[PDB]
Design a protein around this ligand. Structure first.
Ligand code: FAD
Ligand code: AMP
Lengths: 251, 315
């Protein structure tokens, strides 16, 4: 039995960040990197399956990214992932969700897992696209926004609950193997705060298959928009709290 | 040219984002002579023809596939066949849980442009230009689609205004491609309630409260204020307050609320979906960069525990 979990190391911006001089991205100096929040839940779900099974389950985490991503992969291993795989070449710079989908699929074909888990979306770009793209390239059954999974290793069907707008869920019976995008809250990750390197040649791809040029949208510019501004209440706690109380009553 | 809009329904009811996409499409098209084609997909979808026979709809296509409600395999095949039939320059999907189950699968197969969760869209000359967020909504990312004859966008809910009035589309019926789906829909489920946060005055707590033993002091603050205690998602995911008190896209929209006090809540898009309409929003957050400040009327950059204790003292 094998479960493959695709994970992303996301970037969050420090205060007072600036746009690069070319206007196409934020300056790298203002980025802090960590594992995508959705991926904590996806990994924990794979590990719950491993734990429940009296049979052997290999949990492999895979990320497409440059060498900074090793930090996140090592932490995944420390939490119990069996193996961790990083895929990269410089030519892959700027690969969008659909191209990442393609690269992950080339890895998954060689790994031949029994299920593939991905997060619902990334906290940085929130494409909510990558995992379902992998499903399309694999031509596998898929479901997005999975809040519950009833699955035994080697079954040929699973029952999932997908989380809808307003709070309702929908139970769906799905053929396995399947790609599932996993939602926040499906479980409680228990550790709340070598790596195998793969090149494009290893997976039969070239420069012309990956990167910004092969992406489905072209970035014209990134910029900091004018946004709504609150009326900031300055002063001590007592006056800030007084302000709030004056607001509460006028209501 | 044609713009194709995919409507959305669930549990016999049309979702209102459908009419938002129709407004978007009508705002977007380059000439009065361009047509907006709306498709509704489902084995019982004829029921929706009255609700989709509205201002701005030129053609309305009812697609009968094998399932009553959303199925990713049926929707991908059906939308693929609609694009083939209508040659649209732009296809608009809602950025919804259903669309997450197939939009990027539909785009992977093809020569189409694609972008998700779009909140600005226009033509500059003949060039379609779409804007979406980046870096947890700290920037706008403006994109175009060089040499793409067909662009698929998913559109952020509650941005585009619906048109008013009836319409008289040409209505047609098609069968979905004969695809045996690889999943089957089973029951809807409402998970296992004291208040209905369609109430007037809310104090809402987020991840900033830190630990479950800190919930009680807020429940006591709300008690004494006359507010109802609600939360953002992480609080309910942790089981600290019931899912019934969760505000946002997969929780409740607080439709009656006039004063909403957001404490240690960053203001994610999904949280804002539930509360951004509130006339007076106060945010209390130690991070001045938090998105919540972009919709709040009043902002206090302070520690929530210090404010809470003072607030309780002054009350
Ligand atoms: C499809 C889907 C559906 C979703 N549905 C919902 C939904 O229904 N409702 C919802 O809420 N979210 C929803 N989300 C989840 C959402 O993406 C965010 O994870 C969530 O809203 C973040 O919650 P938060 O603001 O409490 O936490 P965070 O983003 O972690 O923010 C915590 C805040 O507390 C502040 N803080 C920390 N300590 C203090 C202190 N001592 N004093 C003052 N401030 C402090 C921080 O500065 C930060 O701004 C959904 C997401 C997905 C993709
Ligand atoms: N570079 C990547 N490497 C591996 N998985 C990724 C990568 N980018 C996105 N993902 C997967 O897709 C999810 C994020 O969704 P999205 O918003 O579509 O990128 C993540 O939680 C991962 O499962």
């Amino acid at each position: 039995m094998k479960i493959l979990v695709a994970v992303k190391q996301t970037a969050a911006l420090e205060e007072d960040f600036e746009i690069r001089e070319d206007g196409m991205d934020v300056d790298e100096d203002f980025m802090m990197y960590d594992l995508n929040e959705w991926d904590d839940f996806s990994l924990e779900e794979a590990m719950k399956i491993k734990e429940s099974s009296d049979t052997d389950v290999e949990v492999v985490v895979v990320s497409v990214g440059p060498d900074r991503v090793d930090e996140s992969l090592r932490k995944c291993l420390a939490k119990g992932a069996d193996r961790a795989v990083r895929v990269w070449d410089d030519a892959a710079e700027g690969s969008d969700a659909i191209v990442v989908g393609r690269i992950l699929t080339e890895v998954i074909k060689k790994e031949a897992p029994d299920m593939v888990f991905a997060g619902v979306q990334s906290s940085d770009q929130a494409y909510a696209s990558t995992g379902i793209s992998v499903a399309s390239y694999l031509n596998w059954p898929h479901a997005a926004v999975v809040a519950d999974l009833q699955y035994k290793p080697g079954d040929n069907k699973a029952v999932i609950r997908r989380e809808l707008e307003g709070g309702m869920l929908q139970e769906v019976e799905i053929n396995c193997p399947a790609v599932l995008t996993i939602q926040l809250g499906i479980n409680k990750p228990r550790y709340a705060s070598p790596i195998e390197e793969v090149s494009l040649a290893d997976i039969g791809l070239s420069a012309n298959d990956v990167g910004a040029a092969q992406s489905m949208s072209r970035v014209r510019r990134m910029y900091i928009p004018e946004k709504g501004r609150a009326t900031m209440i300055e002063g001590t706690i007592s006056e800030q709290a007084a302000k709030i109380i004056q607001i509460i009553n006028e209501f | 040219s044609k713009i194709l809009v995919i409507a959305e329904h669930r549990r016999n009811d049309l979702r209102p984002v459908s009419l938002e996409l129709i407004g978007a499409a009508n705002g977007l098209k380059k000439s009065g002579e361009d047509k907006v084609v709306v498709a509704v997909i489902g084995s019982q979808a004829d029921a929706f023809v009255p609700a989709l026979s509205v201002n701005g709809v030129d053609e309305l296509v009812v697609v009968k596939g094998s399932s009553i409600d959303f199925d990713p395999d049926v929707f991908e095949a059906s939308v693929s066949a609609l694009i083939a039939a209508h040659n649209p320059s732009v296809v608009l999907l809602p950025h919804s849980v259903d669309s997450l189950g197939y939009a990027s699968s539909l785009a992977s197969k093809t020569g189409y442009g694609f972008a998700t969760d779009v909140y600005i869209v226009e033509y500059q000359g003949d060039e379609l230009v779409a804007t979406r967020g980046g870096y947890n909504q700290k920037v706008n990312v403006e994109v175009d689609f060089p040499g793409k004859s067909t662009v698929v966008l998913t559109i952020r809910p509650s941005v585009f205004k619906p048109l008013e009035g009836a319409g008289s589309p040409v209505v047609s019926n098609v069968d979905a491609p004969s695809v045996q789906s690889r999943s089957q829909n089973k029951d809807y489920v409402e998970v296992g309630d004291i208040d209905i946060t369609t109430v007037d005055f809310i104090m809402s707590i987020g991840r900033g409260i830190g630990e479950e033993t800190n919930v009680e002091q807020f429940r006591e603050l709300a008690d004494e204020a006359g507010a109802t205690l609600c939360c953002s998602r992480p609080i309910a995911d942790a089981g600290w307050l019931p899912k019934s008190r969760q505000v946002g896209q997969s929780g409740k929209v607080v439709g009656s609320c006039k004063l909403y006090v957001a404490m240690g809540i960053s203001g994610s898009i999904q949280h804002m979906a539930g509360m951004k309409h509130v006339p007076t929003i106060i945010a209390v957050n130690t991070d001045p960069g938090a998105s919540i400040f972009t919709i709040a009327k009043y902002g206090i950059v302070a520690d929530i525990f210090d404010i809470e204790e003072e607030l309780k003292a002054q009350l």
